[PDB]
Amino acid sequence: SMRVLLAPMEGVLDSLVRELLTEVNDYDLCITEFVRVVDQLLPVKVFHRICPELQNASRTPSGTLVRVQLLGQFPQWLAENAARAVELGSWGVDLNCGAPSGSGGGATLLKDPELIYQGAKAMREAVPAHLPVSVKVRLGWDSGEKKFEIADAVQQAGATELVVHGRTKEQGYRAEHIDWQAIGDIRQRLNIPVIANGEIWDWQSAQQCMAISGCDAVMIGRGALNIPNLSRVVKYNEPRMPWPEVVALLQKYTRLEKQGDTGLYHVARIKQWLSYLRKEYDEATELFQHVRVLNNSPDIARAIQAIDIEK
RNA sequence: GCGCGGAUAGCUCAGUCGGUAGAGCAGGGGAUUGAAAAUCCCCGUGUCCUUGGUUCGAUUCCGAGUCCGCGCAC
């Protein structure tokens, strides 16, 4: 039966939003924003700012497990930073092989799958054996020709599981190009679990994805902001969160403190989440207009909190 | 002169469809020391090369300019 992962989303799904979402969902796991590794062991404070859940045994307050993601190339430094992530409490570690476009990392590793093998292998070897080492890949740089070589590099590295985002790097976030079929081909070749990713917005689209890919584990990104209870919609075919409950969730958000807030976190992030929500809720367009021009946190917090959920 | 790619803190670098830039090192302060170094605590406010524009909001998108690297006009 079905696993649903919350995707890593740099600048969107930080610890606050992971707190808020996990409370009203049944996500099986969340991935952190990437920790960017070059050629040094990063200090403890970087891992704690990216993953505050490390001080709660790698769990959000409602209890959902969280896993730190690394983005980088050099095997020695991926290994040292992976070991630190798990020593700090991370429930395994994830390698990013999908980020666009320099120091090597993300999607660039997809041009030479040997680098995926070396990076992931060194990670697997530095992390205690029963903690998961996952890798998240796109299908290729500007084509899908190497997708089997990529998947095979991850498996031969000894990785626990592979998430496949069903697009090349050059295909971006374009909907017409999603290739759940290719995820399925990859799933049939590998012995390790393959988790499908891309263009899951609701129950029906998750059913289509699982039917076509053959996966019963999926990862959801953008759709998890559009519809804040998407995991339950997808798993149990519940209705999308009603608009008054979405507004209550945003109110809660405005009451969470962001560590190191340079002053405009809620201005930024309330407006950002609203731009996702208006793809789905007519009501989010009105609310976005009402807060559009508020340019400080006191003002936006006061306006969001003043909305009467009963009216 | 023409293409393509660059320009982020004193230096080396990080920076996901636009959401408010942060590590390491140097450096400054504390502890420590006879005084230092090393170690532990603290300092991360940059016209994001300059400029105009779009936008509620630009390192990011658009125009202009400069400088740098590569390969084509002397």
Ligand SMILES: Cc1cc2nc3c(=O)[nH]c(=O)nc-3n(C[C@H](O)[C@H](O)[C@H](O)COP(=O)(O)O)c2cc1C
């Ligand atoms: C704003 C944004 C930030 C993202 N940041 C990351 C990231 O930090 N790491 C990563 O592996 N993928 C990242 N992704 C990719 C997503 O995890 C996911 O693979 C992609 O959005 C496709 O899934 P979706 O159609 O369900 O959104 C990001 C995507 C978006 C839109």
Ligand SMILES: [Mg+2]
């Ligand atoms: Mg962003």
Ligand SMILES: [Mg+2]
């Ligand atoms: Mg825009």
Ligand SMILES: [Mg+2]
């Ligand atoms: Mg010093």
Ligand SMILES: [Mg+2]
């Ligand atoms: Mg600053």
Ligand SMILES: [Mg+2]
């Ligand atoms: Mg400018």
Ligand SMILES: [Mg+2]
């Ligand atoms: Mg204006």
Ligand SMILES: [Mg+2]
């Ligand atoms: Mg401007």
Ligand SMILES: [Mg+2]
């Ligand atoms: Mg524009």
Ligand SMILES: [Mn+2]
């Ligand atoms: Mn950069």
